[PDB]
Symmetry: D2
């Protein structure tokens, strides 16, 4: 069984696929325990990545994966059948210069299960041993599934929060915009990784309440003049860092206007077009900084935090065959935190 995109703007088809083949850079087959559903999956179905990615249809979605080793190629070391694992979403060579510098997402021969090739919305998936991080041998299936969103939502929030932390200090304000699958993790990470005052923005009451439970110092309903609210909270100074974990035209429109002098907007969500006068860029000396997933070391560090119990994903557990219900709900803002699908 697998959930596959045959056509854009249609439901995924839940159907039988062949067992994955060990081949080429794919030397590990994982039995999926939990597969996170990302807003990127909505964008994928919508066709947003067609131009840039040009993938062969059909293919199985799912790029946020935990599971157990099923089978490995001869020569793969340190991995036996049954070993619990989390998967970095990039499959990379380790040979090009970016890889030699540790930047997995900038590797010249990158493949990405669930984005441009078959992913984890399936009973089994192939990946590379270089993408595997081993989890404690005794981890419970329940705890393992709970960690699935660390593989994409969490690692992306973590790298972005690392960026943020560089200019945050006590008394600094950070606006975290969008308390969603990524953003609710970022609220937690901002509190663990910086001493900054955290202002969380969203447009559903239950998500604002989730942000408070997770440590946000202030919450702002962005349906009601978010710039004015944030300017009030910051005594007209604006925020030192804003982080857009939504990426809609709406948020990309207003988030640059949250920034104070030498303010930085970390752009994580996508879909909208950035439009901002350069005279403001220079007169405020602000920056707009993309952040992309994260690297292997960053996933290892985030897994450590989770194992220490310092970050915990809010997870809504569903079955693989419920994927279309879950995607519909995610489009409508009806998923609190992160949905994760299980076989």
């Amino acid at each position: 069984k697998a959930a596959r995109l045959h056509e854009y703007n249609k439901p995924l088809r839940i159907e039988d696929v062949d067992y994955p083949r060990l081949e080429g850079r794919f030397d590990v087959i994982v039995r999926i325990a939990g597969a996170g559903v990302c807003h990127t999956d909505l964008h994928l179905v919508q066709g947003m990545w067609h131009e840039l990615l040009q993938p062969k249809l059909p293919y199985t979605l799912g790029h946020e994966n935990v599971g157990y080793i099923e089978e490995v190629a001869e020569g793969v070391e340190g991995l036996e059948k049954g070993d619990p694992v989390i998967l970095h979403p990039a499959v990379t060579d380790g040979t090009c210069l970016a890889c030699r510098a540790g930047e997995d997402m900038h590797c010249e021969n990158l493949e990405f299960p669930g984005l441009n090739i078959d992913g984890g919305f399936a009973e089994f998936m192939r990946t590379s041993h270089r993408s595997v991080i081993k989890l404690p041998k005794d981890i419970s299936r329940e705890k393992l599934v709970e960690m699935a969103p660390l593989a994409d939502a969490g690692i992306t929030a973590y790298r972005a929060v690392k960026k943020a932390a560089r200019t945050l200090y006590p008394g600094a304000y950070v606006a975290i915009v969008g308390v969603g699958g990524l953003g609710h993790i970022a609220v937690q990470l901002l509190k663990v990784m910086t001493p900054a005052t955290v202002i969380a923005l969203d447009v559903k009451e239950e998500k604002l309440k989730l942000a408070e439970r997770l440590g946000a110092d202030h919450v702002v309903d962005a349906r009601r003049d978010p710039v004015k609210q944030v300017m009030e909270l910051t005594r007209g100074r604006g925020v030192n860092v804003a982080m857009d974990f939504v990426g809609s035209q709406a948020t990309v429109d207003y988030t640059p206007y949250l920034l104070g002098r030498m303010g930085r907007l970390i752009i994580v969500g996508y879909g909208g077009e950035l439009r901002f006068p350069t005279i403001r860029v220079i007169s405020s000396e602000v920056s707009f900084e993309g952040s992309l997933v994260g690297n292997y070391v960053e996933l290892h560090e985030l897994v450590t935090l989770a194992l220490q119990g310092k970050v915990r994903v809010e997870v809504d557990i569903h079955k693989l065959d419920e994927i279309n219900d879950v995607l519909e709900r995610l489009e409508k803002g009806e998923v609190l935190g992160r949905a994760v699908l299980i076989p």
Copy 2:
């Protein structure tokens, strides 16, 4: 005598003004030796700063100034009549937190001679002692005048090149876009301050030749598909840093498309609106970073470089009463390097 903006989109009026008053934060009067003409002066006349600055008309323009001390308030130390000086363009308190951190342009009570108040297109100007940098006692009037553009064009290029250098390395490419008053200085500074391969872009043949004389490794005529040219020079990888020292809609349109993976666009020129899809911001993991003039330490470091003979401004010397001819020429692209006006 002084050149003053009475009305927007009109020539400046060359007329008699009163001698400046020592008052408030203005405890130094300088006899102007050289006053640089900046493209910002065109933007000022056009009204671009009216909304953000709301200054009282008329006022004298000119924010790129060198001269000799004429008079100082009692209590001003280390400054006598006749001392040659260069002026940092910001007049600041030194008391707010930004100032205590060394960031003059982020000072909460900033004034800026020639931008929002009377400047240096005049025989005399008032400023603060905190804005003064003393030059060698024996400097010739000729050499002093040659240094005038360091006070704004140069310090702005220098801070921006400091930003650039942070991710440049041997084999890295930097595109420097606009070999103008600021940009021709930036070509020199890129070669002194980084080991990067410098690609200079402009749209007048003589400016491309100036860039070659100043050390550009490659030059590109941006009237002929600059993105394609730069992609060819960089074997489809793009540039590690692009620097926009033009700020027109034209350049803001194309400069983000010069960037390679983890590429950074340093935005210096202004006037255009930045418009770029977030899906590209994240998929390339690029950033867009404003740079604003520079701080007092940065001006001191740049003055050192000039005194070492490691940067030299290309200067077109004119009389104060020729200001309107010079502004017309600057609008039309007829000034090689930087015009400087003398009494």
Copy 3:
């Protein structure tokens, strides 16, 4: 006009009358002292450790960790009036030299330092510069003000040092904080607030190890008992990513470099001991030894913010000014839990 003054090295301070401070020049603020912290540097001062380097005129009043209330101000001083509660940055600087223009108060060319080389805060009143003043909330209680006194030197020093540490700490990294003293017990709290590192605190007194436990250390180690071996066991032989010496004795300067793992960094804050380490080990582990000196004005402001947020709190032992010599004796013996603060 009572003050505690150093007249001779290796003798008790003299508690005596002195004239009221002169409001003049760069000394454009006089403060009525509310709380004056006692630092291990004060023992070093009395021992004569700073004579060679600072060559101060004797006698002078000690005390460089000060909070109080404005008494009066000179012309041109803005936003300060009699009664305003304040905490003082220990450096008195010009604001004109290049260091000052870059924001590094401790590297100002014309630096004077109340309590170190000129009269300080172990007195009813003390002169300083408005540039050294940070205003506290007008409503603060005297008790809370006094409890903040150690932030002015112990706290700011620990905070700058922890900022240095944080630059290479990450989840799963270990930091050894050595010396849970006046500075060190603050550093334990700051390492938890400012980094995600696993915190191992070392000391030689049981009550200081318990203090570190209450303040959030993940592990504590009694350094009378083979500290390097204990730290190597805790880190599975990898050593620590950052060690921080908040003691500075020969004993600690000798063992702390050996706590470091590969690319490890020793932040040296305490002083008195001589660093001695083979360069072959410096390069083969690629380690660094980095001094840290008090901190700058912005750093004191950030730290005051953390304190007002309730995220850092100093363990204080309050005594009267005229108990100064008894307190210095206790401090030399390791009998002050946290920081002693003197009040009028």
Copy 4:
């Protein structure tokens, strides 16, 4: 199958036959050596300085600064075939541990180092990992290839150290580069290419001071003659922003910390001597002492780029392999101008 091998410490290397290297496991490349640089570390090795730390099996072939031509490769190795000119990073690493995944080759858990602890390049052939190989332009002349040999250890070490230096250098800052040796003469060039600092070069031989002058040093200083006082005069008593010890003797380790100005940084590259400096000076000047260890693969690639651009060039003294012991004698005596490189 000729090689220069260490059998006993404090004796000449033995020039003898050895079997051709075994292509196996992580050793998936064999190179025909074209040029093998001789490092001061080779004198330290023969002296037994590394025995304690590395505990290598004797005998083994020295030489860790190598260029050559691919001879053969094992399965799975891409983009390399017999005859390709190459320069070798001196570390042989797995690419799997966390250090490797972060790009720090020198901190890889399973690190092996040809010439230091296993057989090296003072031989006709040497085994290594494809991960250590950087391909040079196919057209390069043998003469130019050999001249690049020192970039593999002397150059990369100077380059990483200069990267560290550059982080706090600015126009008007001074850098003292101490030891215009095999590493140091490269560092002089790199300081000019990579920073805007004023470069003061120190050595104890006239010909090395002239070399530094030709390579662009702004000032040179004969360190037999009160180097600290001469540097203090050059800097108007401020000292240097960065000092770089490319000697590592007790003599230099003793004086180089005293070159530092406020917030100054000593980059320790040379080794052999013991660092000994008062902590009161470490904190009162807020100085740091920072080791630097060879460099990573990306850094070797950047340095090779600078060399191919003509922006750095090594001063080489070319000798035959079987002159190794005469060359080591000259090096111990300070009689090698630049870097000695051995050829077949």
